[PDB]
Amino acid sequence: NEDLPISMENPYKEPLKKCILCGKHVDYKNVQLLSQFVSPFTGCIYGRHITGLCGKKQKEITKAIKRAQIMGFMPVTYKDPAYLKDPKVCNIRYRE
Amino acid sequence: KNVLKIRRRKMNHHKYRKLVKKTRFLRRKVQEGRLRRKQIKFEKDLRRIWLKAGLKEAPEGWQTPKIYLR
Amino acid sequence: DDPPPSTLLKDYQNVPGIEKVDDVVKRLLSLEMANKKEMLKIKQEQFMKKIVANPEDTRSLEARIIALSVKIRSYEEHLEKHRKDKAHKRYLLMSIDQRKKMLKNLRNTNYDVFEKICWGLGIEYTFPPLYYRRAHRRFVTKKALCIRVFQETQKLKKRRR
Amino acid sequence: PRYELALILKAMQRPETAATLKRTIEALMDRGAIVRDLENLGERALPYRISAHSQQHNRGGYFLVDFYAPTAAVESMVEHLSRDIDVIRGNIVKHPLTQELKECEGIV
Amino acid sequence: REVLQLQEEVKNFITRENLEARVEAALDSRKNYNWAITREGLVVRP
Amino acid sequence: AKHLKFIARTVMVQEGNVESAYRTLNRILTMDGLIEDIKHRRYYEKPCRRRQRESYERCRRIYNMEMARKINFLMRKNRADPWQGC
RNA sequence: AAACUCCAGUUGACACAAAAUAGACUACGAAAGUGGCUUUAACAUAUCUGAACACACAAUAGCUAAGACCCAAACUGGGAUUAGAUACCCCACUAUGCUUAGCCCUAAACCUCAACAGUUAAAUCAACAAAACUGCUCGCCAGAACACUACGAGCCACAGCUUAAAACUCAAA
Numbered sequence: 167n168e169d170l171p172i173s174m175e176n177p178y179k180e181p182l183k184k185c186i187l188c189g190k191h192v193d194y195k196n197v198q199l200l201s202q203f204v205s206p207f208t209g210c211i212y213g214r215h216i217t218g219l220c221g222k223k224q225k226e227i228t229k230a231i232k233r234a235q236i237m238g239f240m241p242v243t244y245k246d247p248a249y250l251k252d253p254k255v256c257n258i259r260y261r262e
Numbered sequence: 263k264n265v266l267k268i269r270r271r272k273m274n275h276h277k278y279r280k281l282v283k284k285t286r287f288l289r290r291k292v293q294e295g296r297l298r299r300k301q302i303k304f305e306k307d308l309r310r311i312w313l314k315a316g317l318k319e320a321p322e323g324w325q326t327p328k329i330y331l332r
Numbered sequence: 333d334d335p336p337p338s339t340l341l342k343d344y345q346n347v348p349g350i351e352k353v354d355d356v357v358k359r360l361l362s363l364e365m366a367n368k369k370e371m372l373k374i375k376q377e378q379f380m381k382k383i384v385a386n387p388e389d390t391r392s393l394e395a396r397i398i399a400l401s402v403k404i405r406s407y408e409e410h411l412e413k414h415r416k417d418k419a420h421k422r423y424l425l426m427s428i429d430q431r432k433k434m435l436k437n438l439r440n441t442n443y444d445v446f447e448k449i450c451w452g453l454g455i456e457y458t459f460p461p462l463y464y465r466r467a468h469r470r471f472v473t474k475k476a477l478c479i480r481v482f483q484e485t486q487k488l489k490k491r492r493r
Numbered sequence: 494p495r496y497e498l499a500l501i502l503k504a505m506q507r508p509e510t511a512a513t514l515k516r517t518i519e520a521l522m523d524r525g526a527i528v529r530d531l532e533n534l535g536e537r538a539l540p541y542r543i544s545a546h547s548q549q550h551n552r553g554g555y556f557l558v559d560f561y562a563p564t565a566a567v568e569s570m571v572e573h574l575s576r577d578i579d580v581i582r583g584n585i586v587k588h589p590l591t592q593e594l595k596e597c598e599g600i601v
Numbered sequence: 602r603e604v605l606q607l608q609e610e611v612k613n614f615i616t617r618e619n620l621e622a623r624v625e626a627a628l629d630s631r632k633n634y635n636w637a638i639t640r641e642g643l644v645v646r647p
Numbered sequence: 648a649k650h651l652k653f654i655a656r657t658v659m660v661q662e663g664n665v666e667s668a669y670r671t672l673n674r675i676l677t678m679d680g681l682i683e684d685i686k687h688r689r690y691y692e693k694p695c696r697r698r699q700r701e702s703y704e705r706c707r708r709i710y711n712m713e714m715a716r717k718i719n720f721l722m723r724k725n726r727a728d729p730w731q732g733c
Numbered sequence: 734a735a736a737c738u739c740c741a742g743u744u745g746a747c748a749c750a751a752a753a754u755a756g757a758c759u760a761c762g763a764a765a766g767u768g769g770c771u772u773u774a775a776c777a778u779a780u781c782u783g784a785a786c787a788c789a790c791a792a793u794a795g796c797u798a799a800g801a802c803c804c805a806a807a808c809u810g811g812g813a814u815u816a817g818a819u820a821c822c823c824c825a826c827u828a829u830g831c832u833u834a835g836c837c838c839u840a841a842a843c844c845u846c847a848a849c850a851g852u853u854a855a856a857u858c859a860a861c862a863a864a865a866c867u868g869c870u871c872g873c874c875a876g877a878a879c880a881c882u883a884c885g886a887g888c889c890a891c892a893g894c895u896u897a898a899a900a901c902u903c904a905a906a
């Protein structure tokens with residue numbers, strides 16, 4: 167009989183979801199990108215429940231932010247005002 | 263778990279620590295005397311060794327060290 | 333002795349035309365401009381060429397012994413500078429134990445290769461002690477006295493006879 | 494290996510900045526380095542006030558020096574940068590391109 | 602291919618001869634590493 | 648101390664609405680965790696107590712999220728009876 | 734109430750101290766532990782098991798020396814309360830927490846689950862904890878208490894640690 171099902175991997179398998187930064191290089195010198203994941207008012211680094219990043223890229227962003235802050239590329243206690251008008255990628259609203 | 267065994271251990275240890283504090287001076291003298299007797303016994307064992315071996319005295323240059331005095 | 337810093341990396345030693353490149357490229361592809369791991373790889377290749385019959389076979393007991401010997405030397409070089417590194421002291425002692433175990437297996441299985449390994453790596457194989465017991469002050473003193481008393485008795489018996 | 498020197502220099506005129514850059518690259522070469530490229534990120538306000546060599550700085554010039562050096566050079570170079578009076582802040586990092594970009598299949 | 606790439610790359614390295622000219626050229630240039638990301642995962646250049 | 652002033656934790660007032668600006672500042676300081684940090688830093692919290700507290704809060708959040716998901720999933724059935732009588 | 738007024742506020746300069754947010758992550762290491770930045774070394778083993786004592790390690794506390802000293806703080810003073818309060822509350826200040834070089838070798842050192850290999854079929858299975866088991870090896874256990882004790886031995890430890898009994902007693906624990 168030819169009608170029997172055949173062993174096979176799911177062809178309808180949807181691709182696994184990817185974070186916004188997947189495949190992209192995160193550099194401590196790219197302060198513009200790093201500033202998109204810190205609080206505008208306190209400079210505190212957002213958690214992954216806000217940034218939506220995967221664990222690997224969350225760690226990469228955290229390390230890059232600390233490196234840039236200590237090496238004299240990024241402010242610590244606030245987000246640099248030059249980057250306040252960049253696209254908002256974090257799921258947080260201060261009702262400001 | 264039985265907490266009473268832990269309590270009994272606490273009581274026995276606390277009672278023990280009180281006794282050593284109370285009799286501390288007496289204990290030190292007893293320990294010193296015990297160490298003196300220990301050193302004497304060690305020396306007697308060494309002397310038995312060279313006496314049985316045949317030598318009338320210790321080997322030349324040998325001096326029994328004090329291995330128990332602090 | 334370490335390989336000269338001018339030595340090429342293991343990965344760039346067979347590419348055709350490596351002798352027709354600029355001095356700058358030669359420096360860039362040498363041990364001078366690399367970490368210590370490349371130097372250790374070159375040491376391992378040198379020992380494999382010098383000792384093992386088939387230097388391409390890395391699964392043999394001799395090859396494993398050579399690799400662990402290089403690792404042990406690396407740990408010792410580290411610990412000369414880092415005297416308080418307890419973790420690396422543990423790693424060195426464990427690597428020494430593992431190399432002794434492999435050397436025992438090699439001696440039991442292939443004595444000729446065992447001798448070649450011992451000569452080439454400068455390893456002195458030693459047999460383990462039969463008993464593991466504390467050599468406290470009383471025992472040490474008594475043993476010294478007993479050896480002295482035996483010597484004195486030997487002298488007296490020589491005098492008698 | 495391959496290193497990147499991020500340099501924050503005193504906000505100076507062109508001749509002094511050129512002299513400082515030449516001196517820094519000469520120190521790199523004297524310590525056995527092969528300098529690949531020099532990039533100028535620009536003069537900008539510092540993220541915060543930096544005190545160096547008994548002077549306070551609010552502006553500085555940002556430069557990148559890519560090079561290949563032996564591992565022993567780095568420490569030596571660090572000491573040199575500590576003494577240079579025109580250097581607000583110098584940092585030698587492993588070159589980011591040498592770090593491998595492992596590929597991801599997405600969130601599990 | 603590694604060696605060939607490095608060979609053609611070394612031709613533009615800073616030696617003791619071109620140090621002055623290269624320093625001046627770098628002083629007459631600007632490099633930008635800044636770029637942002639969007640919610641769609643797209644890069645927006647400055 | 649070494650940073651530029653009047654940028655961090657600063658709110659502008661709109662049409663003289665001082666109270667709205669102050670309440671927005673309170674909202675920001677609470678959402679960024681600064682209020683909780685200040686209140687928790689008055690006295691020293693022992694490392695073991697800190698670890699226990701963080702573990703408890705994480706587990707409580709997870710459990711509450713799961714319970715909320717369960718109720719939201721079973722709220723679909725909550726409607727008018729379609730087979731009344733039988 | 735004491736205390737300070739060489740006090741307090743803004744600004745500037747300014748650690749041998751400990752390291753917001755990330756971390757709603759659950760990673761590294763044999764364990765202890767490890768969560769600021771950079772760089773250099775660097776995380777044993779291509780059968781498994783294998784030690785109270787051998788070989789290396791081991792939080793906190795503690796002991797020797799020198800050093801640093803912001804803050805905290807056993808002790809020690811003052812203020813207040815109380816029937817008493819030398820505890821709890823307030824103020825000040827030590828050993829100590831830190832660095833260097835040596836010791837000491839203890840923890841609810843706990844996932845209270847010994848290491849490797851295998852199974853999910855059975856009757857699942859005293860109970861609870863953490864689904865039930867199998868093969869193999871090492872370590873350990875044979876009523877309670879006396880007893881984290883006595884004596885002996887070893888130990889850089891000397892009011893210390895490891896090992897660790899017996900006599901009397903009970904019908905329980």
Ligand SMILES: NC(=O)c1ccc[n+]([C@@H]2O[C@H](COP(=O)([O-])OP(=O)(O)OC[C@H]3O[C@@H](n4cnc5c(N)ncnc54)[C@H](O)[C@@H]3O)[C@@H](O)[C@H]2O)c1
Pocket residue numbers: 462463464465466784786787
């Ligand atoms: N005592 C030895 O030196 C020794 C020598 C060869 C083999 N073994 C084996 O080790 C096992 C343990 O023997 P035990 O009960 O008499 O020792 P033990 O525990 O009673 O202690 C007695 C002495 O043996 C040492 N010891 C203890 N365990 C050992 C081990 N696994 N290997 C080597 N030495 C050890 C100790 O250092 C101690 O000095 C036995 O199976 C034995 O066959 C012991």
Ligand code: FES
Pocket residue numbers: 183184185187188189219220221222223597598599600
């Ligand atoms: S999902 Fe692939 S890097 Fe984040």
Ligand SMILES: [Mg+2]
Pocket residue numbers: none
């Ligand atoms: Mg083993």
Ligand SMILES: [Mg+2]
Pocket residue numbers: 784
């Ligand atoms: Mg045993």
Ligand SMILES: [Mg+2]
Pocket residue numbers: 785
């Ligand atoms: Mg023990």
Ligand SMILES: [Mg+2]
Pocket residue numbers: none
């Ligand atoms: Mg300790």
Ligand SMILES: [Mg+2]
Pocket residue numbers: none
């Ligand atoms: Mg003090």
Ligand SMILES: [Mg+2]
Pocket residue numbers: 843
């Ligand atoms: Mg526990």
Ligand SMILES: [Mg+2]
Pocket residue numbers: 847848
């Ligand atoms: Mg075991």
Ligand SMILES: [Mg+2]
Pocket residue numbers: 881
């Ligand atoms: Mg104990």
Ligand SMILES: [Mg+2]
Pocket residue numbers: none
């Ligand atoms: Mg005793």
Ligand SMILES: [Mg+2]
Pocket residue numbers: none
């Ligand atoms: Mg005892």
